[PDB]
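Example: Ankyrin repeat-containing protein.
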Amino acid sequence: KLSAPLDMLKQMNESTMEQTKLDELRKKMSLQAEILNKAKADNDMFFRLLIELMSLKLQGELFKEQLSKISKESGYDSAQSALIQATNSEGQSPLQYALQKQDFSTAKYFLDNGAKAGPIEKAVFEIALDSKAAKEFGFPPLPPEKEKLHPVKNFGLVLGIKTTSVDGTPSQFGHIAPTYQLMTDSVSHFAKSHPGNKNFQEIANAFQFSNEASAFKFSTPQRNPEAGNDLARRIQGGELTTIPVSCKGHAMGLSYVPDGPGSKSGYLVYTNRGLGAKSSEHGTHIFRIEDSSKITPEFINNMTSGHSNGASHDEIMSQIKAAAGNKEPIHHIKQKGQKNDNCTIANSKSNIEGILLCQKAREVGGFDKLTESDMDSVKKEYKEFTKHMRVEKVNELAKALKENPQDPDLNNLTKEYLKQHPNADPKLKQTLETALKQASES
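Written out as structure tokens, the predicted fold is:
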């Protein structure tokens, strides 16, 4: 019956390349482009035409003909030339784009036309494999081996290290379940080492509640209807509640901060530092919620299952705006842009700075009444948290590297950290350099 899925997996594996090989291929085709000395290709035009083409939902053969025309119209010799070289402003190749959108028919046509699967394409594919669209295409469930967080992602996502494991696994894209668990542990560990910090007792309690009630497996919540009933009830009772939120191939940040226990008003804190947000809006947005009853079980079920149910960014975003009465946010926290990552750590963690802001606003009686020193206090506690999380992960990395001094991944993670964070606290650098020295010991 479903041999198309088997065929696509075969193709994806035949077309696999290491990143450096794929970069060579691309660079060599750039040299050939310069020999011909024809006009420069227009990637933005290609993707515009590509996205229009995909929405027509054409059958394979017509699709492939149209794909040839728009490649040429965009300045490429062929569909294959465009497929191997074009990237959009998010840095996605066409194949990455089709997989991120869970458009497996288009992804397979791209493969038929010679598109290559580097480590990033394969990671985005594995994420897209855990979705209703993947099941309906005939794919099986992911093997349970892939449930564990790869060490290159555990350290890579927390510490911000871009690298690839020796086995091909990039540090960038992660499933929701193990990354939400890692956030829940990081927040809880901080809360426990700082019992006088009342804010973080609330935050740890909220993550623990949502982490358990959502019961993600890979990137699909496992008790969809009930979980949203639980979270909505917690919000209705006026308790700080986090809301795991995703769309196709992307995770955002979302939480509800109550005015007080049993209150009906509070704030909805939304974070997106990456795909789908304009660079000017990268960061965290705080909406005033006058009546929490608009944060319904259905809304929350839609938020948590956004990726598995194939919701688009605009569908999720519009529901978030609806729950806030389509009013504009009252505050924006600008936060560093991210690209080529589904932000399972980035958006969840940066959302906490918005939670802390709202906790301060609550206690001084409103956003009206925040002073400059209040908001510098907020930023100071947020940075105290992210410092704690960073220091523990560097110590964990040094420890791991000394107990397995010959592992290529631990060594390369350690080296790449120092290379990519030159301005790192000297105590962090010291800890990792001494670990690297120790490792070179046979």
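The chain has 19 helices and eight strands.
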